[PDB]
Design a protein around this ligand. Structure first.
Ligand SMILES: *[C@@H]1O[C@H](CO)[C@@H](O)[C@H](O)[C@H]1NC(C)=O
Lengths: 49, 49
């Protein structure tokens, strides 16, 4: 549910000790994707035209 | 045997009184935020605790 939930389940009790604790971190979401390393060739239609 | 000349000798020493405090997140370090990993971590559980 929250950081205190993780802290409570870390100590396996409803009561814990007062202090400073390290809870699991979080990550900024990726803004998108980029795909640029190799591009293909184009089909030829000049003999058609 | 009595001295006649003297010097003020310096002497340096160091005491490692305090190693560097560290903390570590369990699931972020081991698991890298991919949901099947967290599903496969809950059985081990209290190792992080
Ligand atoms: C005592 O030692 C100092 C430094 O080594 C030197 O300059 C001085 O001449 C000495 N004196 C005597 C009496 O040996």
């Amino acid at each position: 549910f929250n950081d205190l939930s993780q802290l409570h389940c870390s100590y396996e009790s409803f009561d814990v000790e007062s202090g400073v604790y390290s809870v699991s971190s979080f990550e900024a979401k990726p803004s998108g994707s980029v795909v640029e390393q190799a591009e293909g060739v184009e089909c030829d239609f000049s003999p058609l035209l | 045997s009595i001295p006649t000349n003297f010097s003020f000798g310096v002497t340096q020493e160091y005491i490692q009184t305090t190693i560097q405090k560290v903390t570590v997140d369990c699931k972020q370090y081991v698991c890298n935020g991919f949901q099947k990993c967290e599903q496969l971590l809950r059985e081990y559980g209290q190792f992080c605790s």
